[PDB]
RNA sequence: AUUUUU
RNA sequence: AUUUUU
RNA sequence: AUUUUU
RNA sequence: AUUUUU
RNA sequence: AUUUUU
């Protein structure tokens, strides 16, 4: 029998770290000690909630549209700003610009937080145009967009992703643009997702009682291949 | 017939009348709590009549067991009861040398001497019953040294004896439940003595039912350096004891007509 | 069906025995019991299982610190003051606020003053300086029952603090108990 | 050797310990009992007052807002646990004379506030007929805008014991009797965070 | 012991009965043993002691009679006696 | 429910304490003689009604055939 | 330390706003002599249900 | 049943090295926790 | 499904010594850490 | 509530 | 990714 | 290299 | 030497 | 004494 030798306790080495307290881990907070008073858990209550389950997935918030660099007013400036929010003008040229802008995620409310929470994403981003003229305004509209592209100029579109909007009972045309860079993973707060132009095509056409202009919201959202990866520390504060 | 009818009666009437909300009114008719009944209980020798009961209570889970399952109380759960019968010493008189046989040496007051004072396990009990019948073991020990002799008669005589005793011709009371013991051989006798009396019970605290007593066979014959002081102890038992009609604490009560 | 007894009409001087799990019902009306935790929190065994304050010592000497433990009439222990009588595992959490020393620890519910003067078995483990233990003594009581009342209801405690230098400090003591048997409950307490 | 020992419930005598304390709840104690009735006709907290002949068929004879605290056993739950929920029992027992015969109705609205004489007619109420067995009761389901209430927060509501028919009497019986209120937690009750105390016993 | 330091109307809590006049005559106990020791000594008040409260005042009405008595009779649904000693001398079975 | 358990709850409590010596204590509930009953009577065109009636009587092993 | 504090909320749901939607967090140090200090105080959360997603803050 | 002896956790004997960190062994370090979410 | 208590690490209680050196017994020195790579 | 991990 | 060890 | 222990 | 525990 | 947990 084992009483050749005396029975004593398990020894072992502790490893680096007396009372580290790792609070980056999941699986380290996860398995912290319960102030409970039988360690125990709760039932949760989602119909109060209005819901049949709680939300597991922080993406598909990404994947919800948003006015980009909304404002009260139209662009002043002929659309030349960050402002989502501008006219379509039946004077303006049959190849004026009716918006013209550099794209960064944090111009978009819902993935500007994300942009303040990870630091890296990958996948495709979707504008959605929506022009609001009556029955009677008809007309097209061709939205381009230069992937990473930095200078602020307008240029010929024939080359850029763009989508050509006629008016019709459908007058929210959208945009997507596949993801595009040097790297797997693409800082979410960097280089420019591209230049986002809007040049006519045909002048907004109209009648005696109908709007000789009208008003455009430029929206955005992630795509279905959507993901974030490293969450950072914060560029900014919400209230 | 009537006057009782007032649960169906509206039960049914809702359930006759109810949509798919169902019933509006629900009516149920029974007997009060406090019904007109007699409860009736009796402990020993007593018997109590109440008219107007109440429902019994009692305390949470309880265990009417009484029994100490640990015992800081070891002894019999019967020792109680049975400590009357306990053997105890009835008697104890010096056996005075130079006493001729057929003196008497020392007698016993049968059967009130078991409660011969307030000291006696039975004294107790024996004070709350007027009627007793019983049966006796008397052990009656008589020391002596080995250079020393003689004889003692311990033999039981019922109250018949007792009365007639003069009547009676010593040497002949050998024909009584005795014990001729001869010293320097027995240091002690055993009388297993049964009620004997002419009478079913006999009166707490009476002498009836006899009496033991312890005589000289043959006087003491004491060498002269040996010991001249023989002491005679009589220890009595109940071999059964039965105390029967109730009576006020230690009051005379006559059984006997 | 429902009888009127269960509709609210009963007698209150046929209530006993103590105890009667009886149902109270009246039209859109049932006993519903609905649970928020996988748990109770109402058993004895868990709710007592959580400790709470109890009292705190500052000691300046090697002295011994001899106190009679009882139940609180102050936090949720006080849900024993319900109770007559207590018996069962009894934890005891103590706290040694010392820079250098050691802290020697025991129970009994011995009330001689004597058989502690040593120290000898009465459970002496060792909370080394600015260190806290929690020992739980077994019911090495001479009464088969603990009066849950009594200023000494729970065993005695005691510390023989072993310091080194001038250092000196406080030993703050709270408790809780492991599994409790307690029976007879007796009527609820007044406030002060 | 860190073992256990035989614990003895028959010197206790009872025949198992006392696992759950709930049971304890839901045992009746007298709101805000006193040694003398209430001498305001009722309209305090006194759950000990007179049901008196006098008092008109709509007359109150004991109005209150009913909190757990008013309670000797559950103000101790009160001060041990934070929350709780299920169904309150009130238990009324008037203590009159064979004779003596008359209906009171006593209501109550469900965490109301405001302490003043309203009609039953909508409130949860009981009609108490005298006769033999005259302790009637009243339950109160749960009703708060959570899953969980605070056992020492909003009242429980207001409990108000109207006069239905005057106290009828004769030569030889009381032209007023008295009366006592209990008050319990239900079958369904629980209690389930323990705080701080808000009171200290003696 | 604790007396005044329990309210009363919680009493309610012992094995009791809340018995109302004019309806019952008499109140029963089963009452088993209870104390914290397994035996008590004889002679003491060990064990506890049974009492009667006044839950509500006697209303008597004008004619009706008032001396009302109040009766305690007492049964012992097991004994056990087993410490031997003199008659009636005081000796502690305690500690 | 109550009011009446006066019997089994006293008569079984002791043949639960009970020892080698039986029970220390019975009891029993019931109904008492003078119960709450109406009686009915009727001869020749007559009809007595009584509502506190009591147990008729008659001699010893009496003969009605007359 | 890390401490795993269940809960023991009296509403069903927290709104997530609240100046309190987590629950207080209590700190009494036991000191010994004249020492003292400060206690820097950080959290997360361990399975956490979050209900009715509303529109993205402002930046201040 | 083990209820003879009063449930506790398991005690055991720390070996030398209160925070030793081996920077030798290879067999150490890929054993470090991650900083990983 | 144990999801009744809160996952929790293991909690052990340490046993007397820190981090004492046991340099009499062989069992305990061939258990010693390796600077080995 | 695979609402630790597979 | 036996890209801890067999 | 049962050159941790059986 | 179930001379750790069953 | 599933009087640690199932």
Redesign the pocket.
């Known amino acids: 029998?084992?009483?050749?030798?005396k029975?004593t306790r398990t020894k072992i080495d502790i490893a680096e770290g007396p009372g580290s307290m790792n609070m980056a881990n999941?699986?380290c907070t996860?398995?912290a000690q319960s102030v409970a008073l039988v360690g125990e858990?709760?039932?949760?209550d989602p119909r109060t909630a209005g819901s049949k389950?709680?939300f597991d997935d922080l993406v598909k918030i990404a994947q919800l549209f948003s006015v980009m660099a909304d404002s009260t007013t139209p662009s002043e400036n002929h659309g030349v700003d960050a402002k989502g929010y501008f006219k379509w003008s039946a004077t303006t040229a049959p190849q004026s610009i009716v918006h013209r802008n550099i794209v960064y995620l944090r111009l978009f409310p819902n993935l500007n937080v994300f942009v303040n929470s990870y630091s890296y994403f990958r996948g495709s981003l979707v504008l959605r145009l929506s022009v609001y003229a009556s029955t009677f305004n008809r007309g097209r509209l061709r939205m381009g967009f230069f992937p990473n592209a930095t200078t602020d100029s307008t240029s010929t579109l024939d080359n850029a992703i763009y989508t050509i909007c006629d008016i019709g009972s459908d007058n929210s045309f959208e945009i997507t643009i596949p993801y595009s860079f040097s790297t797997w993973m693409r800082k979410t707060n960097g280089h420019p997702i591209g230049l986002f132009q809007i040049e006519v095509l045909n002048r907004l056409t109209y009648n005696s009682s109908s709007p000789s202009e009208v008003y455009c919201i430029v929206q955005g959202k992630m795509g279905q291949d959507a993901r974030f990866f490293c969450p950072t520390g914060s560029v900014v504060t919400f209230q | 017939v009537g006057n009782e009818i007032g649960g169906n009666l509206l039960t049914k009437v809702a359930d006759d009348a109810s949509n798919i909300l169902g019933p509006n009114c629900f009516a149920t008719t029974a007997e009060p709590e406090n019904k007109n009944v007699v409860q009736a209980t009796t402990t020993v020798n007593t018997t109590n009549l109440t008219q107007h009961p109440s429902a019994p209570t009692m305390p949470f889970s309880p265990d009417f067991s009484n029994v100490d399952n640990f015992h800081s109380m070891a002894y019999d759960i019967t020792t109680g009861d049975k400590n009357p019968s306990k053997l105890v010493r009835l008697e104890t008189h010096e056996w005075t040398p130079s006493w001729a046989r057929g003196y008497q040496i020392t007698h016993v007051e049968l059967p009130k001497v078991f409660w011969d004072h307030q000291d006696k396990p039975a004294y107790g009990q024996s004070r709350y019953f007027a009627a007793v019948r019983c049966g006796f073991h008397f052990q009656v020990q008589v020391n002596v040294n080995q250079g020393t002799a003689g004889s003692a008669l311990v033999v039981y005589e019922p109250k018949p004896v007792v009365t007639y005793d003069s009547k009676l011709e010593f040497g002949a009371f050998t024909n009584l439940p005795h014990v001729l013991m001869n010293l320097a051989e027995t240091t002690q006798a055993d009388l297993c003595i049964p009620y004997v009396a002419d009478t079913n019970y006999v009166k707490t605290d009476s002498s009836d039912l006899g009496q033991l007593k312890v005589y000289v066979w043959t006087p003491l014959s004491i060498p002269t350096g040996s010991a001249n002081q023989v002491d005679v102890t009589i220890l009595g038992s109940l071999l059964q004891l039965d105390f029967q009609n109730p009576r006020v604490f230690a009051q005379d009560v006559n059984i006997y007509d | 069906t429902m009888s009127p007894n269960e509709l609210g009409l009963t007698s209150a001087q046929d209530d006993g025995p103590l105890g009667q799990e009886k149902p109270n019902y009246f039209l859109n009306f049932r006993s519903m019991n609905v649970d928020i935790f996988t748990?109770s929190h109402t058993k004895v065994?868990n709710l007592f299982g959580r400790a709470w304050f109890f009292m705190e010592h500052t000691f300046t000497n090697e002295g011994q610190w001899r106190v009679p433990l009882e139940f609180p009439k102050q936090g949720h222990g006080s849900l024993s003051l319900l109770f007559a009588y207590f018996t069962?595992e009894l934890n005891i959490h103590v706290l040694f606020l010392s820079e250098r020393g050691f802290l020697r620890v025991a129970h009994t519910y011995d009330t001689s003053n004597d058989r502690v003067n040593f120290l000898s078995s009465n459970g002496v483990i060792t909370v080394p300086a600015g260190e806290q233990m929690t020992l739980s003594a077994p019911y090495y009581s001479n009464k088969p029952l603990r009066t849950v009342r009594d200023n000494n209801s729970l065993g005695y405690l005691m510390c023989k603090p072993f310091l080194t230098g001038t250092s000196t400090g406080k030993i703050e003591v709270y408790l809780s108990l492991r599994?409790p048997?307690f029976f007879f409950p007796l009527p609820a307490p007044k406030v002060t």
Request: charged share 20%; with cysteine.
């Open positions: 029998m084992s009483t050749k030798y029975w999941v699986l996860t398995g858990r709760a039932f949760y389950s709680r | 748990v065994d069962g599994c048997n």
